[PDB]
């Protein structure tokens, strides 16, 4: 007597979304000039990693970036001189994510251990030491990023997310809406909302202040691995294992564009937009990265520089270059 | 020429590289294994028999030394039922030590399904699996009791015959030997169907009290190292 109400409400929501489907993104953008062949070249090659690279994150200054390597060491890489700035030893070797504070003073990291540790980089001691340890989760941390110098979001594998306070280190806000293991999350530019994708073929939008899920997007056929926010702050792309990328708009509450190909039978690992958002770089398991057009849904460029599974892909704040990291323990800068 | 801060940056980079050299040396000098097993298997006894802070820890590390070689075994801690995502983090491990209870005939099918899933994984197709059939004395007692039959759960047990290459232990009932060899065969039929020479399985029989598993693990790691050295050099 309870499931019938839920299913009829879901059918009503589906009918309401279908009624608002006036046209498609490809139909409106069918008479525009294409982007042509977007060919990028390797400018800098970062060597020094020991184990396979799992994640990376750029900085607000577009100069220094952080990367995560499973050998138990975090290296701060320079995009200009390719020199190693800091070497942070990790207590846990199985790392899966890394973050960089907007002010450039703290760096996050996590993995199989249920702790998204924060390490300081501008302390008076000069070296790097353990700054804070956020314990309390019951699952592996997939990705934890920074929002400010006071709060920090953490996405764990226990189907729950948690916004912690840096000063107190306790659970300030909780999110228990997801049913699968939270795989990725992307923050909004206004630092007020964030879209999280889990192992349920669906994404959910949450608020940092309200602490409740307002929008839920479905349509995928497998688990979503990565998710990135659009520069305008109204849409977001999600890639899954079904070799298809789906663009969902917050203000429209419906899928806009679907990127797929017949020769692509591998899952998406990382997605990220440029400064304008016209080109979407998606990493696949076929050792190559594909550049899709946000308006034409056409393959703009192919990156075949890595010889292993592409793990992380990050675009700078100004869109000057793209840093790609794979299991081959090499970070490559493309421009 | 370079500036004043560029020299200090180059010196810092060279120091970090010299430190990463020793880090890589220590990393390659130590082997890493992935310990897996159900709750009924009883891997706690295997962990506690190995000799050299938060309660919500999801991964435990046990470091020991065998034949002057360091081995760090990793055991899964507080993790949920889904194990398809984080398993990809163990792509560069040396071996996967999978423990199976033999005295529980009801979960033998689940153990075989888990072994098939691990062996046929896209990212685990190049990693060797070491099978530890724990609780041999309990299986022997259950077979000598006779209160439960094996053919009710596996019809192939009614048609399986003891191979000529068997090595019966001194003072052991032939029925227990036939049962354990049938279990070994059932476990190896999955590893031999998708082996293709890139990886192999190491079947071993572990009892309750055993102080020789360390040497077996060391020999298996040495064999895996020999195989990967032969494969990377193309002598293979």
């Amino acid at each position, epitope marked *: 007597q309870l499931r019938q109400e839920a299913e009829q409400l879901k059918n009503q929501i589906r009918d309401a979304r279908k009624a608002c489907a006036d046209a498609t993104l490809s139909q409106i953008t069918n008479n525009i000039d294409p982007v042509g062949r977007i060919q990028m070249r390797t400018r800098r090659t970062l060597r020094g990693h020991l184990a396979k690279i799992y994640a990376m994150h750029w900085g607000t200054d577009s100069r220094l970036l952080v990367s995560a390597s499973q050998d138990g060491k975090l290296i701060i890489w320079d995009s200009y001189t390719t020199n190693k700035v800091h070497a942070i030893p990790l207590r846990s070797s199985w790392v899966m994510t890394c973050a960089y504070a907007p002010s450039g003073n703290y760096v996050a990291c996590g993995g199989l251990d249920n702790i998204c540790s924060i390490y300081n980089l501008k302390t008076r001691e000069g070296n790097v030491r353990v700054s804070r340890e956020l314990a309390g989760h019951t699952g592996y941390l997939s990705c934890c990023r920074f929002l400010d110098d006071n709060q920090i979001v953490t996405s764990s594998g226990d*189907t729950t997310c948690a916004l912690w306070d840096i000063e107190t280190g306790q659970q300030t806000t909780t999110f228990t809406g997801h*049913t*699968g293991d939270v795989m990725s999350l992307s923050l909004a530019p206004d630092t007020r909302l964030f879209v999280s994708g889990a*192992c*349920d*073929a*669906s994404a959910k939008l949450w608020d940092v202040r309200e602490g409740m899920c307002r929008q839920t997007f*479905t*349509g995928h*056929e*497998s*688990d979503i691995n990565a998710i990135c926010f659009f520069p305008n702050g109204n849409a977001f792309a999600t890639g899954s*294992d*079904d*070799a298809t990328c789906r663009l969902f708009d917050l203000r429209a509450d419906q899928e806009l564009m679907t990127y797929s190909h017949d020769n692509i*039978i591998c*899952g998406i690992t990382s997605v990220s937009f440029s400064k304008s958002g016209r080109l979407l770089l998606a990493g696949y398991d076929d050792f190559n990265c594909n550049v899709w057009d946000a308006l034409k849904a056409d393959r703009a460029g192919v990156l075949a520089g890595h010889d292993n599974r592409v793990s992380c892909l990050g675009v700078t704040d100004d869109g000057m270059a793209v840093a790609t990291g794979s299991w081959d323990s090499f970070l490559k800068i493309w421009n | 020429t370079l500036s004043a801060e560029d020299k200090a940056a180059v010196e810092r980079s060279k120091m970090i590289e010299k430190q990463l050299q020793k880090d890589k040396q220590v990393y390659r000098a130590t082997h890493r294994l992935l310990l897996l097993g159900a709750d009924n298997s009883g891997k706690s006894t295997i962990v506690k028999q190995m000799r050299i802070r938060v309660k919500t820890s999801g991964i435990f590390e046990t470091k020991f030394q065998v034949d002057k070689v360091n081995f760090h075994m990793f055991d899964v801690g507080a993790q*949920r*039922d*889904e*194990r*398809r995502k984080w*398993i990809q983090c163990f792509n560069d491990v040396t071996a996967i030590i999978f423990v199976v209870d033999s005295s529980d005939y009801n979960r033998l*099918q*689940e153990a075989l*399904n888990d072994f*098939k*899933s691990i062996w*046929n*994984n*896209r990212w685990l197709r190049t990693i060797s699996v070491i099978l530890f059939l724990n609780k041999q004395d309990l299986l022997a007692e259950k077979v000598l009791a006779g209160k439960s039959k094996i053919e*009710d*759960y*596996f*019809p*192939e047990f009614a048609r399986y015959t003891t191979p000529e290459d068997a090595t019966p232990e001194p003072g052991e009932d032939p029925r227990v030997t036939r049962a354990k060899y049938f279990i070994r065969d059932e476990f190896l039929r999955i590893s031999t169907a*998708s082996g293709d020479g890139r990886h192999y399985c190491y079947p071993h029989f572990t009892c309750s009290v055993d102080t020789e598993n360390a040497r077996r693990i060391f020999n298996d790691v040495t064999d895996i190292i020999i195989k990967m050295n032969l494969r990377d050099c193309g002598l293979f």
Partner: nanobody
Framework: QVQLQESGGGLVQPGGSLRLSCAAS????????MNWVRQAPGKGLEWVSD????????SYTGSVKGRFTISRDNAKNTLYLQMNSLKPEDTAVYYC?????????????????????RGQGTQVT
């Protein structure tokens, strides 16, 4: 959206035959591996049958081997299961699971308690 609707159960005396039908919606039926599992009162999830995409690779468990027959229908995206010679110990809830990654041979999370790509199951007594 992923949707799996199972039907064809009911109460039947031991020795009869049943025809379970599973309909899939929201994904490609021919590009994923399918599994049938069972859950009995007082015990956990137990795997029963597995069938690949093309229907060539078919496997059953030793407990019900020889009696159950699983088949696919790509023209309507349906999964049929004929159960003959039902034993009195077959009173359980049957569930249908789908592999997470397409074009893969892995069989992970098919016996997990929390799984999104799984129907509601049908009772067989």
């Amino acid at each position: 959206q992923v949707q799996l609707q199972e039907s064809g159960g009911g109460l039947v005396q031991p020795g009869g035959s049943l025809r379970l039908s599973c309909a899939a919606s929201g994904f490609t039926f021919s590009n994923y591996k399918m599994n049938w599992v069972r859950q009995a009162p007082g015990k956990g999830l137990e795997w029963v049958s597995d069938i690949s995409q093309s229907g060539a690779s078919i496997s059953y468990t030793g407990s019900v081997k020889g009696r159950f027959t699983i088949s696919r229908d790509n023209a309507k995206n349906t999964l049929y299961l004929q159960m003959n010679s039902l034993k009195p110990e077959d009173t359980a809830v049957y569930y249908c699971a789908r592999c997470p990654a397409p074009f893969t041979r892995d069989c992970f999370d098919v016996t997990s308690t929390t799984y999104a790509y799984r129907g509601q199951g049908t009772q067989v007594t």
